[PDB]
């Protein structure tokens, strides 16, 4: 399917499915 | 009768065996693949995607999928787009309370309800209100094939 174009690698690096945010 | 040989003219439940919550990323990729009959187990997908046990990123997921010939794209779509052409099993990025980041498999969005397959849960359906609260953005849309419509 074509919904649009893929973004920069940094976006994919930001996206995570087994990570933890608010590290504090 | 026999007007068309509908391949997989029925919906099935993909029984993916969960190991750790970090496997969720690979489990997502596995769910879509096996849904279309492609025998790709989350275990093999883990080593394929270079699954990081501290941060399984979508960057590795998409590349590894494409290594299988399974075309994937990393796009950004808003909640309004969910009511447009969303009919894909897809790996979406959700972060609960800005703490725990996981991937959930989107099936379809209807009546403002997003049907997702969470690797840590069963089949859970979140409203726009619920979904957008944890879903910041980021969808890895998956293509069932190139010319897979043909035979």
CATH fold call of chain B: Cathepsin B, Chain A
How would you characterize the largest beta sheet of chain A? Answer: none
> Helical residue percent of chain B?
10-25%
Shape assignment of chain B: globular
| Strand segment count of chain B | 6
The biggest sheet of chain B amounts to: 6 strands, antiparallel
Beta-strand level of the residues of chain A, as a percent range?
A: 5-15%
Which terms would index this structure?
heterodimer; A: 24 residues; alpha+beta; 1 helix; elongated; B: 151 residues; Cathepsin B, Chain A; six-stranded antiparallel β-sheet; 4 helices; 24% strand; globular; peptide binding protein; C39 peptidase domain CtA substrate; dimeric; CtA peptide
How would you explain this protein's 3D organization?
- Chain B: Its main location: membrane.
- The complex is a heterodimer of chains A (24) and B (151).
- Chain A is α+β, with helices and mostly antiparallel strands and 24 residues long.
- Chain A has one helix at 9-14; one strand at residues 18-20.
- Chain B is α+β, with helices and mostly antiparallel strands.
- Chain B has one domain (21-142): Cysteine proteinases (Cathepsin B, Chain A), CATH 3.90.70.
- In chain B, helix 1 (24-35) packs across helix 2 (42-49).
- The longest helix of chain B is centred in the N-terminal third of the chain and has 12 residues, at 24-35.
- Chain B is globular and about 55 Å long.
- The A-B interface holds A 1, 3-7, 9, 11-22 and B 21-25, 28, 51-59, 61-62, 73-77, 81, 84-85, 87-88, 91, 93, 95, 98-103, 138, 140-141, 143.
């Amino acid at each position: 399917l074509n919904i649009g174009r893929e973004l920069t690698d940094e976006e994919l690096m930001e996206m995570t499915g087994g990570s933890t945010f608010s590290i504090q | 009768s026999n007007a068309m040989l509908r391949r997989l003219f029925k919906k099935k439940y993909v029984c993916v065996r969960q190991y750790d919550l970090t496997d969720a990323g690979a489990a997502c990729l596995s769910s879509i693949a096996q849904y279309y009959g492609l025998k790709m187990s989350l275990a093999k997908i883990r080593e394929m995607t270079g699954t990081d046990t501290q941060g399984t990123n979508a960057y590795g997921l998409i590349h590894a999928a494409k290594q299988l010939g399974f075309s994937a794209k990393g796009v950004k779509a808003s909640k309004e787009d969910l009511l447009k052409d969303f009919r894909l099993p897809a790996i979406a990025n959700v972060i609960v309370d800005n703490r725990l980041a996981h991937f959930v498999v989107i099936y379809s969005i209807k009546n403002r309800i997003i049907t997702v397959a969470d690797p840590g849960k069963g089949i859970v359906r979140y409203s726009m209100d619920d979904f957008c609260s944890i879903w910041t953005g980021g969808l890895v849309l998956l293509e069932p094939g190139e010319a897979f419509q043909k035979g």
